[PDB]
Amino acid sequence: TPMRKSNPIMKMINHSLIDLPTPSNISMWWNFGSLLAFCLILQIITGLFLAMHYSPDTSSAFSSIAHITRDVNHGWIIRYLHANGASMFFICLFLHVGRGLYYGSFLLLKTWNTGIMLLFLTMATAFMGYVLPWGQMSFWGATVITNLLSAIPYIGTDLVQWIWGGYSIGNPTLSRFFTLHFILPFIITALTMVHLLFLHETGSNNPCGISSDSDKIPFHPYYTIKDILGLVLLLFILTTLTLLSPNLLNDPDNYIPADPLNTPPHIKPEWYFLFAYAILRSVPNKLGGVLALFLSILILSIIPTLHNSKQQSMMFRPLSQFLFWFLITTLLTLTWIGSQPVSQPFIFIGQLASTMYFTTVLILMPLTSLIENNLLKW
């Protein structure tokens, strides 16, 4: 035998990414998982460096970041890279989800469920990093997200006070944010390995939705060079964002330190969250609002159950495709509404967008699938 197959560690590597049988015909939409992994690695490295200069204390956090960006050699670009890498991470994440919704890869149940877990974990992590600078937006974001558990009817307020460690947001809460933000990424790493373990038991779905076991090619050299090309492209975009236009996504209100006595007139979270914010804004009831907020993501878990089609992929299903793109526009609409004041036109538009989101996932797609079946005479 070759050494490639002489040994358990080596043979696992070989079954993973040398002699793995991959479909010949998968497209660019399948590159975004490797880019996700790359992004995780980038974040961990840049974070370990930042960590050695940051101060988890409310009387010096802000100024520690000032110190990083002004006195540490090239510290400014390390900061820039961390912040922009998070944004890239979520871009890839959203595109990665959407692929699977379009091409019917949710029928790999274990992979799909571990994906949902990973989405949740990544969001938690990103939010707990966003409050560390202790600027004016960070503070009130913390406040809202930790008051969320007050909606639990019997035990909520006590949960809030047990997470605060006191009567209010304060120094004891910031160290908790920092410990959790430190530890979560590694749990994410382990669960990613489990995710891929589950994947390699079946292999990759493909655009046509039919079995590809007659035309499998090896992962090396084809997809090795293909993914390397994808990585080169991602690095070009990331560099241009870091050096040529660093302030594109930046928010001025987080360059004012925290003031516990004043909330600013215009409130806006980080962009990858706006849509949830809009959903949360759309229900005139506290408990109902929070419930909707969490269901908006948890609803992905029952898509496999509502599947009626005989065919797996939307490639050959046009009515389906039309609905898919309408759903994507509803999400764009929620993102846009999240940016606007809480005033009447936007209130009404947001409520319609929310009802149409759930409607579409839960009702319209199942019924169009049945119509489609009937048109093909089965």
Next chain:
Amino acid sequence: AAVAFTSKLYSLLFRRTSTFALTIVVGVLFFERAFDQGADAIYDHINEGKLWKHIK
């Protein structure tokens, strides 16, 4: 023949796993309180006169 204590104990309580578990939770509820009280009594008694509870 001889209805003996451990046999009744097996047949009523321990034969079925759910009931075994229930027996265990019920026993711990009462053991905890009895055991605490005994220990606190002994402790208090070893060093009477030196604890601020009574000096108060």
Next chain:
Amino acid sequence: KGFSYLVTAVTTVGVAYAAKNVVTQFISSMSASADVLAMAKIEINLSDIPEGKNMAFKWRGKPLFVRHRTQKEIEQEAAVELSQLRDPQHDLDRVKKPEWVILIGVCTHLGCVPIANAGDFGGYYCPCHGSHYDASGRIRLGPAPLNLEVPPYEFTRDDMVVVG
């Protein structure tokens, strides 16, 4: 069989006791420490607060509003129909002197600080998710479930009030 199973039972009971104690003390590590729990009172001098002015003071880590209401506000807050409220309450259930009102400046929805003299009702407006309050601190529009909270106080001088 009975005897052998009795031994296991007893062992399990002891293990449960030990586990409960360990886990609970670990959990009580994360509750408020013995240097965070101070509770002081606060004294406010009222002759520095003009008519129509809302002042905010820091108290027990959170804002405390003191509002010096004008006559038309005292009049129009009384007109309100209590049947059209989600947390019904009359103004005189909420003040000790009509021209002063004292509140805890925290929004009952998710904790943001209402801005004063804003919204549809002349009271306060919360930017975070859009709840409106009236000059009695009553919730009038938006997702919040309750009225703004009133602390215990008392007047020690016609120009001094103590909140505790």
Next chain:
Amino acid sequence: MTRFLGPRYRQLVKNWIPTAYTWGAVGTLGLAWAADWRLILDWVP
């Protein structure tokens, strides 16, 4: 599903009801004992 409507399934569920409510008792009392839940524990002599 629609498959699990029929005689055998009714009989089979009846077979397991008692074990079910016994495990329910176990879980309830354990939760209460673990969280020193006074709402239930104040009634224990």
Next chain:
Amino acid sequence: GREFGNLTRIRHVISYSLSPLEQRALPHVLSKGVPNMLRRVRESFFRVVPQFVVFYLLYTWGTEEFEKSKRKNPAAYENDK
């Protein structure tokens, strides 16, 4: 498990290939690739584009309306005094 020795059962299929060093990497772009991209755009245009057009109309409308709402109404002062 899944391994190139026993994936499936096939009979009577013939394949032919050249080596990479025998052939060109970008053989015919403007005579074949461009028209192909054009038809590939044609086949999907009406399944994707109109939804986004509708989004654009909604966005512009809502912006205009919000901005009108902030301008003072003359009848609010002229009507009664």
Next chain:
Amino acid sequence: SASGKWLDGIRKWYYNAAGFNKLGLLRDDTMYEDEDVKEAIRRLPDNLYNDRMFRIKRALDLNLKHQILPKEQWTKYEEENFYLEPYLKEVIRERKEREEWAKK
């Protein structure tokens, strides 16, 4: 009555919109292989099995090459063969019978 011609009209429209005919594929080729479908595929005679396998490989190759067949070679709506339906119906009957035994 006319309603037949009308329904068949919309059905032909939907078939051309789907476009698996552009790749040289039959409808029964495009099913997802659940348990019953795999058992129906097991039951096929050799000629049908081999024809299916080659057709599918050919579609995959075309998809790899972002290309389609010449229009002259597209599958036409009026002369298609539902070769797998009969076997699938039998498989499903058998499973239904077993279920119905299981509830007594």
